[PDB]
């Protein structure tokens, strides 16, 4: 006679119809379990608010009509069958954005009880509300939801193939090596319903992620406190030295090659620059400040009482001539030397502000590396 | 015996014609109830004036043939069907520009009167005139066009599934950390005729969205302030120092490359420009004034009737060797005469050019708080 | 009975074939009228040299088989066939260059004499040589070719639906508010020939284009003056002093700072470069020359004739005290060497802030033409 | 009479089936034999992960139906037969990231005893854990797994066609003037069980790979030596000096400069950055504190005796009018001679400075000729 | 009685296979004559080594079953067929990449005895082993290989339709309004076997192209040179000024922005780079040798190996009363370099060596140039 795996085929798919759900009394549904397992975290992208991945899913489903008896077809139980062929739910993802490209898997397995597998990879684009105020240790809770578009309830439930905390503990798969690390994948049943009759099911996976800032940190921040040191002992140096001048404009001139570019390093969103350009804004800030009030003092001791009170409360002939010309320092000196003291003590002021700055700069950074240590 | 559904999909898909209009009196239209709803802003190119968004789309309509009776299939009266065994319309955007990666829905319900229900999601790309001109503050008045690209409307009506104002605050699906901001969709109908016999019906879904402000504003307009406040720092440098000179040749150079990556920055405008921009290339005019000045007096120190009826008419528009080196020791202080000729000149055009650049500064924050004005009230 | 429309159907599509053209006599060809809108000018690529548009494309033409009598099918004139089901001609671009994604129109109208109608968008991807040598105010011929790929004129003529007057008048479908503008759109039906004996049908559309210069004149036309004024300024400067020769090199930093984003937002064609680079690099020349000259008068100062022979050629065309005063009279003395060179370093000083000033006026004066030749079309 | 090849494809393609693996005795699986051949390394995503590439994928296997006796079909012995015509096994790659685009290829040759061959190329795109530590010179292990998604050793058990030694050999096919070397295809093979009842049988293709450093190494190393140089005369001026501070900023523009250029240049996973980045900031480090030391220096010699005991220990562990005039003058020399011994232990600690930035700079020569020994290694 | 042009099509489509070889005598092969003609070049990743390409390409074969007596047809000696509904060839290229967007032809033309026309744009992407030395006036010689990936010489033998003088002089649809000129298209054709019993027939088409550098030289030849005359003039300086020290800053920072148009210009390739990068290295590391040499010099003028540097002035010369004593300090005044005179005279004439060294890497750069352009307007 003929093999048992073509007859099988043959009399499964004829007289079937794939539009039409597998069932026989339509009152009923027909669930499906499935499974999420999170291979890779592709693209983050900040500005756009998606979210690029790549997964394993898995799906089941009961099929009324898709059964026989093993003993007729040589005791065959499992049976190989293309998709294309057979009714499939259309469950899909609410948060989709765009298409992944994901290739296709034209075959599927089917018990002799009408149960289908369906295994299949899928890269996929979603939409995700991400908070960057702390940029390098930030960390997300970004959402997939599964559902069916159309189907209802009474058609269609979402259920899963196994407990949630084996979902949670996966990481078989999952690659380390990137940017992003995986926390958990924490699923989540519930019901959804548009309007009264219009119930929905749902599933949802709230995909927990991790940033590893190592790059970004020694790649940004500390040529920052590079930047905030050098600032700090160009402030040591001492007070109008035309030394200190050129100081203060190479740093300006480092600050401004660095914020430009690391603007375009730091992904910015919706909220306005994370918490390190705001430092870097106010450092570069009392650079510029410090630096005018440099050439201010510099041009003032080129040859008032309101502001030094604000401040003070803020808390042979011939021969004599040209000694006199020796003395003409002096004469200026009593002008030039309160004039050089103010400035000198706003020197300081600045400084004391900058301090703080840089402080609050190391606090925040390990309260926001704490935070990540929340592992 | 046999399944109802097997049974009835048998009877409602076999000898169906996917092909055919549905209906059976011909002279009828059929008509197409829809929804809108925005899910997402996802991308808005002001260079080309396109849109990106992504929808849920429903619509309605009614077919002759899928018809049957309840209780001959077991009281039931609702089935899904596939979407590409039936006859579906060809609606679709006006205002398209390019097809966008949109999942595919095989699956329709169909109720036993011939109603059938599509709902599917839409990544839509879209052209739309954008004004760049208040470009951190503004407001869109995009539009959603729908219709058919062929049929006339003696074959489909367009219709609205909901009332106006329900879809206009279905802000239920939105997503609000994106840059961009829904303030409402505005649906409304009109006929459209290229000319006689192409009587083509149409839908009008005014999307309108806000911008919001502020990583642009925080990461552009203070790295420009701190331009202006060097810049005035420049005009306060001594006017006899040449060190002045390469300070402002610097910022000269600064505001060149500053218009250089908000050319390569910001999506500049097809039309038109932004006022910041205005501003900031006024800035640097007064620079290189102040620049051009202070070299001028400078190689003057190193006329004054020009100097004096200038001033006249803006005055008419206010409306032994030891004696020797002591000669020396006044030499160092003897070129004064020619000096003072043009130090006066110096140091008033310094504060000038100073104050106007403050004026200037003041007009920007003044445009820059009325269209905070026209974002808020929006 | 039945409703006349799904007979109607039946009596056309079965028995019908796609592959076959739908002619009785196969000497006669398949005439098919189109015509064009420019719905918007999406991007040109100055660098890749492409053009992207979006058209509303429409076509006519005529089948021998779907033809009916209306009294049959009550009174049925019209209806809506799927394009999939029928024979359509392979109507292309020859300018063509990248699949266009563009979405698909299933339907189709056919009349019951045999006429039918394809309307349908169409996104374009195809080539277009740009003179970018007026790159502020460069204006385009481009154009986009229709005809068969494969498909003769003796099978298939191409045609107008409308006249070309009538064609080059439309405007009524356009976004206004992109860089580029439409002044036009010429046809010129021709005929093709690869070889003789393969006679080939063209049915051509001029596109033709024009920019906006507005925000590009901005970001490049004004600080472009505003450096060649800062170095008219700068030349004014005293010749020994060398913050003249600081502000002239950091104004040549400047100037090449210019033409990097010159040579960054022009990726433009590598046959031809515009002549805004070409005036603003020999501004930068002359700035060079000046501070070369600069350099060497300034060596020559402190501590030479046949310079003077030359340069008339072209004009042709108490021991102590005494110390003490000698000190006072050689530091003011230094100058005389110095002058000997300044009198000629002025007048180097002074040519090259003419032919500066001159090369400025030129820009000017080019410019100005340049928007008159816009403002002409 | 008709052909040949026309008869046997009727013979053939009739009553065969596309869904059912072709078998007789279901209990046995069918193998599938390919070959892997790599024509070029196309791009190598430091960043994201990622290796894309292009092959010249072989594959074997048997039908138990497409058989026949060439006999009768005019000694026929082969023929071309589509490749969506018959049963193909889902062979595909857990390291897939995106789909590649790859040409169908619609034939496949088909022998008189059920085998099969399909040849095809496959551009694929897949994640590799990459090492950028030795960045200039980094080597990678990249892997391409083959398995069925779906089908068991059951039913499908993957083997090779030719011999391993075979297939590290070739590389009669590929393009040397990529960025990136061939070295080597390593096959494996393995089972894959997620769980008892998942047996998955797998081939492995450990593709290795050697990147071109020339360009890397004139681009980071030579600005990096011409700038370690530069601190080296740097610390060799003597101490109160403005050119060494004045030198020292230039050279913290320089360093600041490179920094940038390195930020710029090397893309980098976050996992770990490389050392060549590490020693830019040392040696900065070095330079800066050094600057301030010189600092500390001219407020010194301007114008603190526990430092010099400490310091001791330390080195210890290491081992008449007219005269009123001429006094005007003489206050020049005064100026000069007001001087502090503190500037002893001052450069002194100078001598600290020769040996860290010396130490320093020998680490980093060394690692990097050991970079290159262990690249010429390979 | 019913049209010829449809009793053809139901007389030969039917009974009519797209998988069998339309042969009737296993044993010969199906013999494709092609052709190649090249519509423009688009791009050229000189970083990536890719070529991509437009070409309007031809194939002609013959099918022993799609014939038929015009007389019994109304003397139809031609028709158009659905393209998908007939054998057709897996004719594909050796250097392809990445799946070209290339529109699709439906029809094909067939006459009555067999033969069959297919034309078609081909959008193409290939890999080619590209040269950057000479990166502003470069010619590279792409290869563009046609041969079928599955079927052998026994089964297809590609043939060609035109001469190769046909071939290579047809550049008239070429437009020469791009960045690319096109030279020639050499066609060569070869059999390949890199086991035994595989005969894959194939054809070569040697794609050869030309740069257009005129846009270049304007962008990035002639300011290079700008940059390395200041820097000549600031060699022409004295090492005492530090306004030389200042000069060569300035023109530092103007290499230091070159950096930025460099690696977006200049193409840089990580195999190799051109000789024109080279010589800009070679410029940048003599201006700031130069600066560390003036800055010696500086180091020099102040005041504390002299017979030493006169040991290397050798090695050149091969290779080449308080009034009275303030009066006394007037002179040790203007006199106080008394010893750095002898070091400002070894700092000008080591001002002058950078400057023979910077000079001979100026005019080989331009020697270069100039042999590039002989070479390129050689061919």
Same mark, same amino acid.
């Given at each position: 006679?003929?093999?048992?795996?073509?007859?099988?085929?043959?009399?499964?798919?004829?007289?079937?119809?794939?539009?039409?759900?597998?069932?026989?009394?339509?009152?009923?549904?027909?669930?499906?379990?499935?499974?999420?397992? *999170?291979?890779?975290?592709?693209?983050?992208?900040?500005?756009?608010?998606?979210?690029?991945?790549?997964?394993?899913?898995?799906?089941?489903?009961?099929?009324?009509?898709?059964?026989?008896?093993?003993?007729?077809?040589?005791?065959?139980?499992?049976? %190989?069958?293309?998709?294309?062929?057979?009714?499939?739910?259309?469950?899909?993802?609410?948060?989709?954005?765009?298409?992944?490209?994901?290739?296709?898997?034209?075959?599927?397995?089917?018990?002799?009880?009408?149960?289908?597998?369906?295994?299949?990879?899928?890269? &996929?684009?979603?939409?995700?509300?991400?908070?960057?105020?702390?940029?390098?240790?930030?960390?997300?809770?970004?959402?997939?939801?599964?559902?069916?578009?159309?189907?209802?309830?009474?058609?269609?439930?979402?259920?899963?193939?196994?407990?949630?905390?084996?979902?949670?503990?996966?990481?078989?798969?999952?690659?380390?090596?990137?940017?992003?690390?995986?926390?958990?994948?924490?699923?989540?049943?519930?019901?959804? %319903?548009?309007?009264?009759?219009?119930?929905?099911?749902? *599933?949802?996976?709230?995909?927990?992620?991790?940033?590893?800032?190592?790059?970004?940190?020694?790649?940004?921040?500390?040529? %920052?406190?590079?930047? *905030?040191?050098?600032?700090?002992?160009?402030?040591?140096?001492?007070?109008?030295?035309?030394?200190?001048?050129?100081?203060?404009?190479?740093?300006?001139?480092?600050? %401004?090659?660095?914020?430009?570019?690391?603007?375009?390093?730091?992904?910015?969103?919706?909220?306005?620059?994370?918490?390190?350009?705001?430092?870097?804004?106010?450092? *570069?800030?009392?650079?510029?400040?410090?630096?005018?009030?440099?050439?201010?003092?510099?041009?003032?001791?080129?040859?008032?009482?309101?502001?030094?009170?604000?401040?003070?409360?803020?808390?042979?002939?011939?021969?004599?001539?040209?000694?006199?010309?020796?003395?003409?320092?002096?004469?200026?000196?009593?002008?030039?030397?309160?004039?050089?003291?103010?400035?000198?003590?706003?020197?300081?002021? &600045?400084?004391?502000?900058?301090?703080?700055?840089?402080?609050?700069?190391?606090?925040?950074?390990?309260?926001?590396?704490?935070?990540?240590?929340?592992?």
């Amino acid at each position: 006679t003929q093999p048992a795996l073509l007859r099988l085929s043959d009399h499964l798919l004829a007289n079937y119809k794939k539009g039409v759900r597998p069932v026989r009394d339509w009152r009923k549904p027909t669930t499906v379990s499935i499974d999420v397992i *999170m291979y890779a975290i592709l693209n983050v992208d900040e500005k756009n608010q998606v979210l690029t991945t790549y997964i394993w899913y898995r799906q089941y489903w009961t099929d009324e009509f898709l059964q026989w008896t093993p003993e007729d077809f040589d005791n065959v139980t499992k049976l %190989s069958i293309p998709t294309d062929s057979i009714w499939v739910p259309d469950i899909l993802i609410n948060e989709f954005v765009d298409v992944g490209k994901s290739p296709n898997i034209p075959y599927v397995y089917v018990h002799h009880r009408g149960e289908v597998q369906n295994y299949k990879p899928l890269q &996929l684009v979603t939409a995700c509300s991400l908070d960057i105020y702390n940029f390098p240790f930030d960390v997300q809770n970004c959402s997939l939801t599964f559902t069916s578009w159309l189907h209802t309830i009474q058609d269609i439930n979402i259920t899963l193939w196994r407990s949630p905390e084996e979902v949670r503990s996966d990481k078989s798969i999952f690659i380390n090596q990137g940017e992003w690390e995986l926390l958990e994948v924490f699923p989540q049943f519930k019901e959804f %319903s548009i309007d009264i009759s219009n119930s929905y099911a749902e *599933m949802k996976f709230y995909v927990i992620i991790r940033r590893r800032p190592l790059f970004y940190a020694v790649s940004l921040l500390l040529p %920052s406190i590079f930047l *905030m040191v050098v600032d700090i002992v160009g402030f040591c140096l001492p007070p109008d030295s035309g030394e200190r001048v050129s100081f203060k404009i190479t740093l300006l001139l480092g600050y %401004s090659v660095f914020l430009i570019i690391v603007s375009d390093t730091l992904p910015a969103t919706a909220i306005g620059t994370p918490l390190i350009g705001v430092y870097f804004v106010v450092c *570069m800030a009392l650079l510029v400040i410090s630096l005018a009030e440099t050439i201010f003092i510099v041009r003032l001791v080129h040859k008032v009482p309101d502001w030094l009170r604000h401040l003070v409360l803020d808390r042979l002939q011939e021969l004599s001539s040209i000694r006199h010309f020796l003395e003409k320092r002096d004469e200026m000196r009593e002008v030039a030397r309160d004039w050089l003291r103010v400035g000198y003590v706003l020197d300081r002021l &600045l400084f004391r502000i900058y301090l703080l700055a840089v402080l609050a700069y190391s606090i925040t950074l390990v309260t926001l590396w704490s935070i990540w240590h929340s592992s």
